[PDB]
Design an enzyme around this catalytic site. Structure first.
Site, PDB file in Angstrom:
ATOM      1  N   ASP A  59      -7.595  -8.058   4.820  1.00  0.00           N
ATOM      2  CA  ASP A  59      -7.462  -6.702   4.271  1.00  0.00           C
ATOM      3  C   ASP A  59      -6.098  -6.571   3.583  1.00  0.00           C
ATOM      4  O   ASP A  59      -5.069  -6.383   4.241  1.00  0.00           O
ATOM      5  CB  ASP A  59      -7.652  -5.633   5.364  1.00  0.00           C
ATOM      6  CG  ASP A  59      -8.033  -4.258   4.801  1.00  0.00           C
ATOM      7  OD1 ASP A  59      -7.741  -3.960   3.621  1.00  0.00           O
ATOM      8  OD2 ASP A  59      -8.625  -3.460   5.558  1.00  0.00           O
ATOM      9  N   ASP A  95       0.386  -5.803   4.585  1.00  0.00           N
ATOM     10  CA  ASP A  95       1.005  -4.607   4.026  1.00  0.00           C
ATOM     11  C   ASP A  95       2.514  -4.796   4.257  1.00  0.00           C
ATOM     12  O   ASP A  95       2.948  -5.935   4.433  1.00  0.00           O
ATOM     13  CB  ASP A  95       0.437  -3.340   4.687  1.00  0.00           C
ATOM     14  CG  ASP A  95       0.338  -2.175   3.719  1.00  0.00           C
ATOM     15  OD1 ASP A  95       1.373  -1.833   3.111  1.00  0.00           O
ATOM     16  OD2 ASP A  95      -0.765  -1.611   3.559  1.00  0.00           O
ATOM     17  N   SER A 141       4.208  -8.501   0.875  1.00  0.00           N
ATOM     18  CA  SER A 141       3.998  -7.835  -0.416  1.00  0.00           C
ATOM     19  C   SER A 141       2.849  -8.490  -1.185  1.00  0.00           C
ATOM     20  O   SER A 141       2.951  -9.665  -1.554  1.00  0.00           O
ATOM     21  CB  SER A 141       5.282  -7.902  -1.252  1.00  0.00           C
ATOM     22  OG  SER A 141       5.038  -7.634  -2.625  1.00  0.00           O
ATOM     23  N   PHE A 142       1.785  -7.731  -1.463  1.00  0.00           N
ATOM     24  CA  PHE A 142       0.607  -8.292  -2.154  1.00  0.00           C
ATOM     25  C   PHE A 142       0.809  -8.661  -3.641  1.00  0.00           C
ATOM     26  O   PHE A 142      -0.102  -9.225  -4.254  1.00  0.00           O
ATOM     27  CB  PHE A 142      -0.686  -7.459  -1.929  1.00  0.00           C
ATOM     28  CG  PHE A 142      -0.613  -5.995  -2.328  1.00  0.00           C
ATOM     29  CD1 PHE A 142       0.065  -5.554  -3.470  1.00  0.00           C
ATOM     30  CD2 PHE A 142      -1.301  -5.044  -1.571  1.00  0.00           C
ATOM     31  CE1 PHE A 142       0.084  -4.207  -3.814  1.00  0.00           C
ATOM     32  CE2 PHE A 142      -1.283  -3.697  -1.918  1.00  0.00           C
ATOM     33  CZ  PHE A 142      -0.591  -3.279  -3.039  1.00  0.00           C
ATOM     34  N   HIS A 182      -6.472   2.032  -7.243  1.00  0.00           N
ATOM     35  CA  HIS A 182      -6.260   3.349  -7.873  1.00  0.00           C
ATOM     36  C   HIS A 182      -4.803   3.853  -7.821  1.00  0.00           C
ATOM     37  O   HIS A 182      -4.442   4.782  -8.547  1.00  0.00           O
ATOM     38  CB  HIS A 182      -7.243   4.408  -7.318  1.00  0.00           C
ATOM     39  CG  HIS A 182      -6.789   5.078  -6.055  1.00  0.00           C
ATOM     40  ND1 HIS A 182      -6.455   4.377  -4.915  1.00  0.00           N
ATOM     41  CD2 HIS A 182      -6.632   6.388  -5.748  1.00  0.00           C
ATOM     42  CE1 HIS A 182      -6.099   5.227  -3.967  1.00  0.00           C
ATOM     43  NE2 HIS A 182      -6.199   6.454  -4.447  1.00  0.00           N
ATOM     44  N   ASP A 183      -3.981   3.241  -6.970  1.00  0.00           N
ATOM     45  CA  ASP A 183      -2.534   3.495  -6.936  1.00  0.00           C
ATOM     46  C   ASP A 183      -1.722   2.877  -8.083  1.00  0.00           C
ATOM     47  O   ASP A 183      -0.567   3.255  -8.288  1.00  0.00           O
ATOM     48  CB  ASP A 183      -1.950   2.983  -5.612  1.00  0.00           C
ATOM     49  CG  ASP A 183      -2.296   3.866  -4.426  1.00  0.00           C
ATOM     50  OD1 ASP A 183      -3.007   4.884  -4.561  1.00  0.00           O
ATOM     51  OD2 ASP A 183      -1.830   3.535  -3.332  1.00  0.00           O
TER      52      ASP A 183
HETATM   53  C1  LIG Z   1      -3.830   3.720  -0.942  1.00  0.00           C
HETATM   54  S1  LIG Z   1      -2.927   2.823   0.136  1.00  0.00           S
HETATM   55  C2  LIG Z   1      -3.843   1.750   1.037  1.00  0.00           C
HETATM   56  C3  LIG Z   1      -5.127   2.354   1.601  1.00  0.00           C
HETATM   57  C4  LIG Z   1      -5.547   1.731   2.931  1.00  0.00           C
HETATM   58  N1  LIG Z   1      -5.880   0.325   2.763  1.00  0.00           N
HETATM   59  C5  LIG Z   1      -6.736   2.491   3.451  1.00  0.00           C
HETATM   60  O1  LIG Z   1      -7.866   1.953   3.432  1.00  0.00           O
HETATM   61  O2  LIG Z   1      -6.549   3.649   3.881  1.00  0.00           O
HETATM   62  C6  LIG Z   1      -1.786   1.979  -0.748  1.00  0.00           C
HETATM   63  C7  LIG Z   1      -1.072   0.885   0.035  1.00  0.00           C
HETATM   64  O3  LIG Z   1      -0.172   0.167  -0.819  1.00  0.00           O
HETATM   65  C8  LIG Z   1       0.914  -0.242   0.019  1.00  0.00           C
HETATM   66  N2  LIG Z   1       2.089  -0.804  -0.714  1.00  0.00           N
HETATM   67  C9  LIG Z   1       2.971  -0.181  -1.531  1.00  0.00           C
HETATM   68  N3  LIG Z   1       3.903  -1.060  -1.999  1.00  0.00           N
HETATM   69  C10 LIG Z   1       3.623  -2.271  -1.478  1.00  0.00           C
HETATM   70  C11 LIG Z   1       4.180  -3.648  -1.541  1.00  0.00           C
HETATM   71  N4  LIG Z   1       5.274  -3.938  -2.282  1.00  0.00           N
HETATM   72  N5  LIG Z   1       3.555  -4.617  -0.826  1.00  0.00           N
HETATM   73  C12 LIG Z   1       2.462  -4.387  -0.066  1.00  0.00           C
HETATM   74  N6  LIG Z   1       1.907  -3.166   0.031  1.00  0.00           N
HETATM   75  C13 LIG Z   1       2.427  -2.093  -0.632  1.00  0.00           C
HETATM   76  C14 LIG Z   1       1.199   0.991   0.858  1.00  0.00           C
HETATM   77  O4  LIG Z   1       1.971   0.706   2.031  1.00  0.00           O
HETATM   78  C15 LIG Z   1      -0.218   1.433   1.180  1.00  0.00           C
HETATM   79  O5  LIG Z   1      -0.666   0.893   2.430  1.00  0.00           O
END
Ligand SMILES: C[S@@+](CC[C@H](N)C(=O)[O-])C[C@H]1O[C@@H](n2cnc3c(N)ncnc32)[C@H](O)[C@@H]1O
Ligand SMILES: C[S@@+](CC[C@H](N)C(=O)[O-])C[C@H]1O[C@@H](n2cnc3c(N)ncnc32)[C@H](O)[C@@H]1O
Lengths: 340, 342
Positions: free
Chosen positions: B175, B200, B227-228, B246-247
């Site tokens: 995930d 995450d 970090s993805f 969508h982010d």
């Molecule tokens: C919309 S959310 C994820 C939704 C979640 N998977 C769910 O099903 O409710 C966006 C995700 O991007 C993550 N994020 C932001 N910057 C990041 C980074 N550099 N590396 C990994 N994750 C990051 C945030 O921590 C957050 O968990």
């Protein structure tokens, strides 16, 4: 069957993208640009200052709310709703939704409502650097736009106020905070033997002079520039307060009524005309007024008032409520005489 | 439509006092304060940080909109609407409307919508000093409140993700951007044989380790902080992306798909679970999704996407769109595989 879903109701109330999608699109004149018919986003984005992508997305939302039609992808045509948003339209909503104008510009205060709750005072200064009257005064063009918008409201309400008050035992009327003088102009032309005095800000009265100062009724009116927190011009038996008390907090609204009482002498008559709130509310009338009241709290220091709150102010400024009536429309009209 | 009808409807659309009255009142905990019953404004005002008159007038607007009751003047009580705004409540909407929390904080960007049409890009920096990610990272307390609020949306959609995909061909799921990992956990115990990984940020996943890393599902899950956008952990045969694209603006979202395509190798899967926008006008929720899209434009650099916007992005990462089926709850699910075959 019925409208019972509390979750849906809450979703209706919490939307903040639609109202600023709306304001923005009116500011950029999209209602006008589509008045003729269907126009694809490339065109609409070019004419207005807009990025095509963002505008497509803003118009997509508003099209989900029935403001615009979208028969194909990225093309947007007019509707019954967009007609009401056009400059063109007789009773246009444009001056109230245009962020170029000062009225909609004041709605940016909505984001500072927490501070407004903490201090109990206005947040126009927090949004823009100066409170509403100061920065409308330091930017004349904003002040002119304010006055032009207010003139559209006044114009609708004028004939009703002129008829709604008795002018038999009145020889000289002062419209205090009378704007461009749209109400006074009507009163005077309706009653050929009346003298008039428009009291307001200097460029406001001067713009009023240009409009109707040459006319038959204009000749019987002094266009007197000045402030109604100071002493008013003398020799008026009637002072008219049409939609000015609700701009001002209680101490300031009091000071205005004092200066009006002072100006009219004993047995002089201060004539107030407002939409007044009514305790056991109602449907769309009372809800709209409650919305407007939060605009008064945030932008101005003001408040919509009940009849009894209006009475507490009048009593502290040497006046008393004589005759309360209402215009066949909802605008209440109160005459006040002096005490003792 | 005809004039007066159009006029009534426009008034509903133009109202900005109500939605900020609502957020103010939720931030102050007024729905919690009236859960037991009627409260006088004096007490509400005292218990919130508020001036009585200011609060009264705010509450009577919300009274006429059905959020609270006012049986006599200046006393306010609960309703079905206010119940949903209590912290208390199971389907609670408070975290989406509390201005002390990160989600409703972003909504202040609405006033800068003209600037967003001018440039195209986000205006969270204009509103607050930094873009959304950077001051979420610079305020740990908001960071946790964000993760707690995202885990609540994860909670209501995780069951639909598990049953919506076929897990037979899968050994080790990952995930990606999965949050605290409510979607992975419901997947790992609805399918006993599988392995897991949750990528995450380190405090987001360490908190997910504390929540369910002790449970039977959590023993098989590697809770990896990272970090993805960088190279993902090695040796997964599927990547799960549940409401993560969508982010992100096209270019960042692309980079994420590439790391997912690379991490699983050939004969692997990139499973994407998103709410997709339809060309027509859906129903309901096309309105709601168009609302959210404007938040994604203003707050983040992001966007709600059609199937084909996804196809282009997966395409440019060397992926094709395979199976396209949809959840009962309205979520689109797509299995992506390697672009070119046999
Ligand atoms: C919309 S959310 C994820 C939704 C979640 N998977 C769910 O099903 O409710 C966006 C995700 O991007 C993550 N994020 C932001 N910057 C990041 C980074 N550099 N590396 C990994 N994750 C990051 C945030 O921590 C957050 O968990
Ligand atoms: C609601 S408006 C106009 C009301 C007017 N009867 C009408 O409907 O056109 C209130 C008026 O008060 C005026 N005003 C505000 N502060 C003032 C001051 N210190 N002295 C005089 N006029 C003032 C504004 O310029 C404005 O024209």
């Amino acid at each position: 069957m019925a409208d019972d879903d509390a979750f849906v109701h809450l979703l209706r109330l919490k939307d903040t993208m639609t109202p600023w999608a709306l304001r923005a699109v009116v500011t950029l004149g999209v209602p006008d640009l589509v008045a003729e018919g269907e126009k694809d986003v490339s065109e609409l984005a070019q004419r207005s200052g807009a990025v095509p992508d963002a505008l497509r997305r803003v118009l997509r939302l508003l099209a989900r709310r029935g403001v615009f039609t979208e028969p194909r992808p990225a093309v947007f045509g007019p509707t019954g709703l967009s007609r009401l948003l056009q400059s063109d339209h007789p009773r246009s909503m444009r001056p109230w939704l245009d962020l170029e104008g000062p009225v909609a510009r004041g709605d940016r205060t909505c984001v500072h409502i927490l501070e407004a709750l903490r201090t109990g005072g206005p947040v126009h200064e927090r949004t823009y650097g100066r409170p509403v009257w100061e920065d409308l005064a330091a930017r004349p063009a904003l002040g002119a736009a304010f006055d032009a918008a207010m003139a559209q409201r006044a114009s609708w309400i004028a004939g009703d106020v002129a008829a709604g008050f008795d002018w038999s035992a009145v020889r000289h009327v002062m419209d205090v905070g009378g704007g461009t003088g749209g109400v006074l102009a009507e009163v005077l032309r309706a009653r050929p033997g009346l003298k008039g005095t428009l009291l307001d800000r200097a460029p406001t009265v001067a713009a009023g002079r240009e409009a109707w100062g040459a006319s038959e009724a204009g000749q019987r009116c002094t266009f007197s520039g000045g402030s109604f927190f100071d002493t008013l011009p003398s020799g008026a038996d009637a002072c008219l307060l049409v939609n000015v008390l609700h701009d001002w907090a209680d101490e300031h609204a009091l000071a205005v009524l004092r200066r009006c009482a002072e100006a009219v002498g004993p047995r002089g008559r201060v004539l107030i005309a407002e939409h007044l709130v009514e305790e056991g509310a109602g449907g769309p009338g009372a809800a709209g007024l409650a919305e407007l009241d939060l605009v008064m709290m945030l932008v101005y220091g003001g408040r919509e008032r009940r009849l009894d709150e209006l009475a507490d102010l009048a009593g502290k400024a040497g006046l008393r409520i004589g005759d309360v009536s209402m215009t066949p429309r909802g605008l209440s009209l109160v005459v006040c005489e002096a005490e003792t």
